[PDB]
Amino acid sequence: SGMEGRIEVTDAAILRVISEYTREAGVRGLERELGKIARKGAKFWLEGAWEGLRTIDASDIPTYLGIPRYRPDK
Amino acid sequence: VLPKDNEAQLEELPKEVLEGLEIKLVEDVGEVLEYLLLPEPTMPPVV
Numbered sequence: 001s002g003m004e005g006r007i008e009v010t011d012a013a014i015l016r017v018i019s020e021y022t023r024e025a026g027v028r029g030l031e032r033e034l035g036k037i038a039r040k041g042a043k044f045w046l047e048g049a050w051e052g053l054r055t056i057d058a059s060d061i062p063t064y065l066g067i068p069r070y071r072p073d074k
Numbered sequence: 075v076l077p078k079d080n081e082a083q084l085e086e087l088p089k090e091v092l093e094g095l096e097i098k099l100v101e102d103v104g105e106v107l108e109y110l111l112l113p114e115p116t117m118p119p120v121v
Contacts, residue, residue, distance in 0.1 A: 067082050 001038040005053060006045060009037070012058040020061075020068040037064045075106055 017037075022029040037056070041064075062068065078099040084092065100106050 067085060071079070 001035065002042055003038055003045070006050070007038070007041040008053055008055050009034075010055060010057060013056055013061055016058050016061050017065070019072050020070055021065060023070050033065060040064050075100060075109065077101065 017033050018030055021033050041054075041056075056064065075098050078101045081097075081099055084097065098109060100109075
């Protein structure tokens with residue numbers, strides 16, 4: 001998706017996306033969600049270009065994917 | 075009156091609607107029955 005080291009996820013964000021946007025046995029949905037995060041990062045690059053590397057924390061996941069779709073067990 | 079765990083889904087709602095409404099978020103039935111029933115009996119009981 002064109003980005004090269006201007007954007008970077010953390011592992012907590014990965015676990016959040018798996019637990020809250022992905023319910024299957026396989027891995028296809030996680031692939032689609034990571035694609036969505038990278039493409040919204042590309043649109044944010046074309047709006048305002050920042051400098052160096054941007055590290056997406058676990059808080060910004062609704063800002064990149066939207067409303068959480070599934071709820072974890074407690 | 076709406077469940078508390080649905081408060082995530084108040085964001086796909088249009089903006090001018092959302093200041094018209096007022097949501098009460100609940101998680102127990104007792105607070106709902108406190109909020110909705112008038113405190114005084116009027117009709118006689120069924121017995």
